[PDB]
From a paper:
Pfs48/45 is formed from three domains, with N- and C-terminal 6-cys domains joined by a central 4-cys domain, all linked to the gamete membrane through a C-terminal GPI anchor.
To rationalise these differences, and to guide future vaccine design, we determined the structure of the C-terminal 6-cys domain of Pfs48/45 bound to 32F3. We prepared Fab fragments from 32F3, combined these with the Pfs48/45 C-terminal domain and conducted crystallisation trials. Crystals formed and a complete dataset was collected to 1.9 Å resolution, allowing structure determination by molecular replacement. The most substantial change was in the loop comprising residues 357–369. This loop is disordered when bound to antibody 85RF45.1 but becomes ordered through interactions with 32F3. While antibodies 32F3 and 85RF45.1 bind to overlapping epitopes, many of the contacts are not shared and the Fabs approach Pfs48/45 at different angles. Both antibodies bound to Pfs48/45 with similar affinities in the low nanomolar range (2.5 nM for 85RF45.1 and 5.2 nM for 32F3). However, binding kinetics differed, with 85RF45.1 showing faster association- and dissociation-rates, while 32F3 binds more slowly but forms a more stable complex.
Author numbering:
A (entry chain A): 293 to 429
B (entry chain B): 1 to 106, 107E, 108 to 134, 140 to 220
C (entry chain C): 1 to 210
């Protein structure tokens, strides 16, 4: 099964395959680069996640970071269960050396289109995954 | 290297206006939110104004809303703060600092700050008064009273008397500043050898030497 | 509007100690950022999003918390950790900071050296009179000064000033000035500054007669 999300690590002998990748080791020091993932189906049976070679912020995916406001307004750390509003989310974690894989599994429809973010840091480098999951038309 | 350099600070009368500026370099300026955060004389940090990456959205707390305007010029890598109807409580060190949506709005770089002093007091030179006792060690003093604006530099014997010296922070007294400086020497070199305080107040182009003689 | 209350205001520690400082919020916040500031420079990023150390911050630091109670801990204090630590939230507008916890280095208790000074002849020619009292090189920071004119207490006309902790001997100093008009100063004869410090139950009394 493919993971809809971002691989920020530089490793190829992994057991997890990601739809997207952004090698954080190649981002400039003090930079904050996005990796954007968009899911759009009437019903899901999907794995969503990231592979981070350093610190993950917040405690993804049980907690996630709200999307960016268009107004000058804060984005808070929230529980994913209440953010996407489905009660049977499955959470998974794995580690391959210094790489940390955090995933969640979603089955069925989502009541409303939602977005959220997870941040990955490695030394002075940082990258963040933004996810959007659409509700049925 | 990421760098933020503030400028524009100075002395402004009550109700006056002033424009602060910040020059950003070493990063993609247009990708970051920018803010002015001030540090009061009591060392409290307060956000004054925030602006998003493209300049389309801003926020001001109620303490300065309507009076202050933050703007940015992404062609020049500059952040500006236009401050109108300035109050005494606006006196603070103003820092330019950045945040990113993708770092959870963490202020990861700050400039060195630019000082704003809001007061209608005029530039006044200080009065230097000697402090002599009316023991093995003798403590002598220098009272520097009624000057404006800050700062005043105080040395003892042109810098040669450096041990046992404390200069106290200035306090506001009738809209003007007052400070004292303390010097401790053994009883043998005083008044046998000369002890003088040298006070400089560059704002009024004044230097005063006050020799401490017994009372 | 969200108030962040940092305690203690001054955290006294010896190098090697394990310490914790707290950041309590008036209402729930979803994270806290921490910054470190030393005199002469701007605040620096220290702890990002409650528990992730900023680049270059040593492993002895950690951060924790949720809801209304957060903290910063140092597993073993080093002398270079003496600084002010600020907590900061942005769960609702406006973004706010705590007033800071200043991590201070301990030293042996030291009684203040008290010196009283009459107004100078130069000041008296201008119509004023300032009586100065120095309370030098004492530890800990807390001290009280009482002014007495002919045995009676006086509160008005007193301005106080406190130095920061000395970087070489770790002591504090205080200045206390009683400002009177020349006429007011000439009505009385004895002037006294009383120093109450924890190093003794009896205050240190310094006086002079005009």
């Amino acid at each position: 099964k493919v993971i809809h999300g971002c691989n920020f690590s530089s490793n190829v002998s992994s057991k997890h395959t990601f739809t997207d990748s952004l090698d954080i080791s190649l981002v400039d020091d003090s930079a904050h680069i996005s990796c954007n993932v968009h899911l759009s189906e009437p019903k899901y049976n999907h794995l969503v996640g990231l592979n981070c070679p350093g610190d993950i912020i917040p405690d993804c995916f049980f907690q996630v970071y709200q999307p960016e406001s268009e107004e000058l307004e804060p984005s808070n750390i929230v529980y994913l269960d209440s953010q996407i509003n489905i009660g049977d989310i499955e959470y998974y974690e794995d580690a391959e050396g210094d790489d940390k894989i955090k995933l969640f599994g979603i089955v069925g429809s989502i009541p409303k289109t939602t977005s959220f973010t997870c941040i990955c840091k490695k030394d002075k480098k940082s990258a963040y995954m933004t996810v959007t999951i659409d509700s049925a038309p | 290297d990421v760098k933020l350099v503030e400028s524009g600070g100075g002395l402004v009368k009550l109700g006056g206006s002033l424009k602060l500026s910040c020059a950003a370099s070493g990063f993609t300026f247009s990708s970051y939110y920018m803010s002015w955060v001030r540090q009061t004389p009591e060392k409290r940090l307060e956000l004054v104004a925030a602006i998003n990456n493209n300049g389309g959205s801003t926020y001001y707390p109620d303490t300065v809303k309507g009076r202050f305007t933050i703007s940015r010029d992404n062609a020049k890598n500059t952040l500006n703060l236009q401050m109108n109807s300035l109050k005494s409580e606006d006196t603070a060190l103003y820092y330019c600092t950045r945040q990113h949506y993708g770092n959870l709005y963490f202020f990861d770089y700050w400039g060195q700050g630019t000082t704003l002093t809001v007061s209608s007091a005029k530039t006044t030179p200080p009065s230097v008064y000697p402090l002599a006792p009316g023991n093995s060690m003798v403590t002598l003093g220098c009272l520097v009273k009624g000057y404006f604006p800050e700062p005043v530099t105080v040395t003892w014997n042109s810098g040669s008397l450096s041990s046992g010296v404390h200069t106290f922070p200035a306090v506001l007294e009738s809209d003007l500043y007052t400070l004292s400086s303390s010097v401790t020497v053994p009883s043998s070199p005083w008044p046998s050898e000369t002890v003088t305080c040298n006070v400089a107040h560059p704002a009024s182009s004044t230097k005063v030497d006050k020799k401490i003689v017994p009372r | 509007q969200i108030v962040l209350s940092q305690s203690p205001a001054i955290l006294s520690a010896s190098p090697g100690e394990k310490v914790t400082m707290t950041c309590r919020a008036s209402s729930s916040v979803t994270y806290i950022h921490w910054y470190q500031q030393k005199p002469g420079s701007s605040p620096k990023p220290w702890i990002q999003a409650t528990s992730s150390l900023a680049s270059g911050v040593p492993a002895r630091f950690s951060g924790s918390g949720s809801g209304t109670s957060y903290s910063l801990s140092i597993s073993r204090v080093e002398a270079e950790d003496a600084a002010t630590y600020y907590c900061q939230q942005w769960s609702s507008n406006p973004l706010t900071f705590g007033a800071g916890t200043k991590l201070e280095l301990k030293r042996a208790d030291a009684a203040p050296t008290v010196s009283i000074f009459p107004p100078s002849s130069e000041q008296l020619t201008s119509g004023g009179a300032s009586v100065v009292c120095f309370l030098n090189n004492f530890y800990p920071k807390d001290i009280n000064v009482k002014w007495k004119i002919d045995g009676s207490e006086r509160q008005n006309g007193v301005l106080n000033s406190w130095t920061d902790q000395d970087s070489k001997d770790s002591t504090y100093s205080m200045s206390s000035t009683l400002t009177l008009t020349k006429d007011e100063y000439e009505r009385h004869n004895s002037y006294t500054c009383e120093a109450t410090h924890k190093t003794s139950t009896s205050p240190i009394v310094k006086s002079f007669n005009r």
